[PDB]
């Protein structure tokens, strides 16, 4: 599924991401825009052989099992394909664990490089929430 901007914001808010560990909702929408272009089916391979999955591009080296990243961990205890669903619950629940591990949203390279320090509230402007 390709979410609309305000449709994704509404879904992330219902699932508790607004101000989760201090990050306002616009941070999460901005991150999703630049990680996946709001597309739950996005995948991208990394140089070390691991793969990033879903609307927030969660990495199989640490967080999910895809059967093909040897020596990796599965800290969200899920198959990576669960992160490609049109239902974003799995992705949100796993992102909560990631952002909690001490590094905040710096875990997401596109957030650090394209969202951090910008007016991220513009990403939820005009939406009815």
Curated annotation (Swiss-Prot):
Lineage per the UniProt record: Eukaryota, Metazoa, Chordata, Craniata, Vertebrata
GO molecular-function terms, A-Z: beta-N-acetylglucosaminidase activity; identical protein binding; lysozyme activity
One GO process term, biological-process aspect: killing of cells of another organism
PANTHER family linked to this entry: LYSOZYME C
Keyword DNA-binding (UniProt): no
Tissue expression as described in the entry: In the egg white and polymorphonuclear leukocytes.
Native source organism of the sequence: Gallus gallus (Chicken)
Compartment list: Secreted
Other facts noted in the record for this chain: Lysozyme C is capable of both hydrolysis and transglycosylation; it also shows a slight esterase activity. It acts rapidly on both peptide-substituted and unsubstituted peptidoglycan, and slowly on chitin oligosaccharides.
Pfam families reported for this sequence: Lys
Subunit structure: Monomer.
Protein family membership: Belongs to the glycosyl hydrolase 22 family.
Protein name: Lysozyme C
GO (cellular component) term, any one: endoplasmic reticulum
